Amino acid sequence: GGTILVVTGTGTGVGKTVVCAALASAARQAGIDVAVCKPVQTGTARGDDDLAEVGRLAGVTQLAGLARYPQPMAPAAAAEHAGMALPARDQIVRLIADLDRPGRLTLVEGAGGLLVELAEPGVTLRDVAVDVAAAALVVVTADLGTLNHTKLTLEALAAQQVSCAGLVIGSWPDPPGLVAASNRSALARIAMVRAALPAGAASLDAGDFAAMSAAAFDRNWVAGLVG
Amino acid sequence: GGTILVVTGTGTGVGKTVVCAALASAARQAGIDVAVCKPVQTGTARGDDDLAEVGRLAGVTQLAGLARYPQPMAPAAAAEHAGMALPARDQIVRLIADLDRPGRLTLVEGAGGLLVELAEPGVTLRDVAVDVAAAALVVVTADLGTLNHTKLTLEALAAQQVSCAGLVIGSWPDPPGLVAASNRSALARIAMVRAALPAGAASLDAGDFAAMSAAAFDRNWVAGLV
Numbered sequence: 001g002g003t004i005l006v007v008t009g010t011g012t013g014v015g016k017t018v019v020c021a022a023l024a025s026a027a028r029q030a031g032i033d034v035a036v037c038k039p040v041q042t043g044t045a046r047g048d049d050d051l052a053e054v055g056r057l058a059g060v061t062q063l064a065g066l067a068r069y070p071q072p073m074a075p076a077a078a079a080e081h082a083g084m085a086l087p088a089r090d091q092i093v094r095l096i097a098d099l100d101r102p103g104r105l106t107l108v109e110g111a112g113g114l115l116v117e118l119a120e121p122g123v124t125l126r127d128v129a130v131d132v133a134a135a136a137l138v139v140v141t142a143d144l145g146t147l148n149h150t151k152l153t154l155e156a157l158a159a160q161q162v163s164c165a166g167l168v169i170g171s172w173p174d175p176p177g178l179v180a181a182s183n184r185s186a187l188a189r190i191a192m193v194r195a196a197l198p199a200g201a202a203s204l205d206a207g208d209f210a211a212m213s214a215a216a217f218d219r220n221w222v223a224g225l226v227g
Numbered sequence: 228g229g230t231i232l233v234v235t236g237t238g239t240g241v242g243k244t245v246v247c248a249a250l251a252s253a254a255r256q257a258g259i260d261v262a263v264c265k266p267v268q269t270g271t272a273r274g275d276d277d278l279a280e281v282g283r284l285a286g287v288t289q290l291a292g293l294a295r296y297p298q299p300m301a302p303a304a305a306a307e308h309a310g311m312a313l314p315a316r317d318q319i320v321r322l323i324a325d326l327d328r329p330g331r332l333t334l335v336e337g338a339g340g341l342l343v344e345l346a347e348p349g350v351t352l353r354d355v356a357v358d359v360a361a362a363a364l365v366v367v368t369a370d371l372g373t374l375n376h377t378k379l380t381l382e383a384l385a386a387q388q389v390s391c392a393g394l395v396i397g398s399w400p401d402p403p404g405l406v407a408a409s410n411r412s413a414l415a416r417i418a419m420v421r422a423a424l425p426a427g428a429a430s431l432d433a434g435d436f437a438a439m440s441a442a443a444f445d446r447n448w449v450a451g452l453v
């Protein structure tokens with residue numbers, strides 16, 4: 001098959017989606033075919049749609065969803081609120097498995113952070129990553145607390161032998177501060193820091209985003225993600 | 228000795244200090260002798276002082292610390308800003324065991340989350356908890372994201388055989404809301420919720436605080452700690 005990356009993060013609202021659109025855009029401009037997948041989508045009644053936003057920003061056409069829930073809460077709670085069920089583990093794995101093609105990078109965004117339940121019983125993105133033998137890209141903040149949460153997540157991946165593809169700082173302030181700079185320096189000591197997307201990257205139009213995406217990642221690391 | 232609890236949390240600013248003060252205040256009204264250790268305190272320029280918070284709110288006088296840094300940063304970065312090192316592991320563990328005696332509940336507050344660097348080189352409250360054979364009380368929020376951060380902290384505790392004494396919600400909102408109410412039922416499914424402290428409890432006078440604290444925890448559980 002090809003190259004599957006779950007794009008997780010240290011929590012909700014850390015830039016997972018914008019990192020998916022950014023790595024996809026950079027991969028695309030490098031010649032890579034790119035699929036982006038969002039198996040569990042909460043908050044649709046407030047207009048949350050990460051797939052739609054990834055296409056808006058990077059022009060990705062190959063966009064796969066499965067389960068959708070109106071309320072902006074944990075998938076488990078969003079589902080029970082609507083009288084609906086969470087997808088089964090094998091439904092998520094099948095959705096991804098179908099996208100996987102040689103020479104294609106498939107990106108899988110979770111809901112919130114690594115151990116949020118996506119399927120009953122207690123099935124997380126970590127288990128999905130194990131089933132499709134994926135590596136995990138961990139989107140982190142530069143804010144304080146980030147180091148505790150990053151190391152908690154890297155430990156959670158390594159306990160299941162899910163390989164860490166690295167970190168992406170999902171928002172980077174221009175210019176940083178003392179904590180923001182110490183965080184970055186401390187992050188880059190326990191894991192490779194693939195990118196640092198400028199804050200507000202989610203407001204850039206096509207070209208700027210594509211310009212940002214290409215400079216945001218080391219072209220060699222991208223093109224090396226999928227042979 | 229007696230009982231040693233590390234009071235960790237899922238992050239910075241979740242209420243570990245108020246929870247220390249509340250458990251201390253409930254254990255004291257149970258006739259239990261209480262000490263609190265905060266080996267490393269940061270943000271001393273803006274006046275942060277968690278042990279004095281506990282002294283005031285709860286009435287504890289056995290209040291032990293080893294190092295104080297001016298800058299409001301994590302200990303390591305605050306130590307680096309100040310050109311000086313963090314204390315050593317041996318100091319922190321021995322300070323805590325010297326506090327520990329029979330009949331006494333000893334509570335240890337680190338800084339921020341479970342894995343932030345607390346002593347030289349790169350040692351954490353988790354390592355400290357291992358060395359002193361402490362259980363961990365885990366302070367949590369009821370805000371979106373708490374289940375991920377909670378499951379992560381419990382997993383990291385279990386990975387080093389550090390027993391979980393339960394969860395405490397550091398600030399219970401008024402009125403809840405669907406996310407906070409839902410998050411509380413889900414947290415009860417992953418571990419015991421020992422208490423949920425009303426929001427703003429950190430500001431109560433010592434007599435009000437002690438009333439709240441007595442009500443907030445279960446009498447038999449608190450007794451059974453020592």
Ligand SMILES: O=c1ccn([C@@H]2O[C@H](COP(=O)(O)OP(=O)(O)OP(=O)(O)O)[C@@H](O)[C@H]2O)c(=O)[nH]1
Nearest residue numbers: 009011012013014015016017018050111112202
């Ligand atoms: O109150 C606010 C303000 C801003 N935002 C907006 O959040 C965007 C960045 O957030 P992302 O949506 O890219 O992070 P994420 O992928 O990890 O989020 P989840 O799947 O877990 O939901 C930014 O564009 C920011 O403007 C909010 O969500 N809430």
Ligand SMILES: O=c1ccn([C@@H]2O[C@H](COP(=O)(O)OP(=O)(O)OP(=O)(O)O)[C@@H](O)[C@H]2O)c(=O)[nH]1
Nearest residue numbers: 236238239240241242243244245277337338339
């Ligand atoms: O907007 C904000 C942000 C932060 N804070 C500050 O965040 C903290 C809230 O909560 P605490 O600092 O009292 O709980 P804690 O014991 O878990 O935190 P640490 O020991 O690790 O530092 C307090 O220091 C509070 O002053 C606010 O009050 N308002």
Ligand SMILES: [Mg+2]
Nearest residue numbers: 016017018050
């Ligand atoms: Mg998202």
Ligand SMILES: [Mg+2]
Nearest residue numbers: 243244277336
């Ligand atoms: Mg504190």
